[PDB]
Structure formats: C-alpha cells, structure tokens
Design a protein around this ligand. Sequence first.
Ligand SMILES: CCCCCCCCCCCCCCCC(=O)O
Ligand SMILES: [Cl-]
Length: 133
Amino acid sequence: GMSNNFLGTWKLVSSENFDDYMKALGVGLATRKLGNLAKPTVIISKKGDIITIRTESTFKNTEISFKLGQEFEETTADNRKTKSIVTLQRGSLNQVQRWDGKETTIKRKLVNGKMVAECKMKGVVCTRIYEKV
Ligand SMILES: CCCCCCCCCCCCCCCC(=O)O
Ligand SMILES: [Cl-]
C-alpha cells in the first residue's frame, strides 16, 4: 500500500501556477490573494487502513480521512462539498474531487525525498513542492 515515506510533516517550499488553479475552481480574488501568500503545512498520518491528510495554514485548515478506493465526503479549503476518492498508482497518491458535474485531481508523489503535489482542473496544472521536517 502507501509507502511509509509519505508519513510525517511536510512544508511548502515552492508553488507554481496556483493562482490560475484557484481561478479554475471559482475562487475569488481576495481569497486567491491570501491563497498565494499561504505557506501551508501538510501532516500525513495513518491509523489502521485510514489515512489522514491535514493541511495547516494561517488562512484555512483542512483535514480528510479516508481508505484507499472508497468514496468519502470532503469539505475543501475553498468550502466545496465534494465526493472524493484517493487511489494509488505507481506509488502516487491521487485524489479526485467531484462536485456540480465538475472534477479536479491532486496527485502526490515522492521525488528524491520531497512530496510533489500536482493540481489539475480543465487543463490548468499547478505544481506544489513540499520538504519534510
Ligand atoms: C491551504 C491553502 C489555502 C488556499 C485557500 C484558497 C482556496 C483554494 C483551495 C485549493 C486547494 C489546493 C491544495 C493542493 C494540495 C496541497 O498543496 O497540499
Ligand atoms: Cl501560512
């Protein structure tokens, strides 16, 4: 299953094309202004087969808890109510969010010791890189 190298606390060190990713989700300017200035912290823990991903920022905190392959109700940082699933493809943690007939994905894979999150929406791609502490 999920490699134990995901487990721990991660810190954003790079974000590319985040403003345009938020634009695609319908995020307003003022909210985007703060989402760009945010340097979140992502904690990934595991209790049994239930994986938890927690995001901590001064602006918004979030937390999801799921079993791989099982749909679950999620409330996103921008307050979307999504029916989401997390799958594992070649050691990549791929999260899909569906709402209002729309859909976006967050793919998280480890690269040379760093967690790389790919955000995708209608051909708009954002790349966020985290370093472990
Ligand atoms: C915690 C980030 C604050 C941004 C709030 C503005 C609304 C945008 C929400 C989009 C969520 C994108 C998160 C990508 C996954 C990650 O980088 O861990
Ligand atoms: Cl922050």
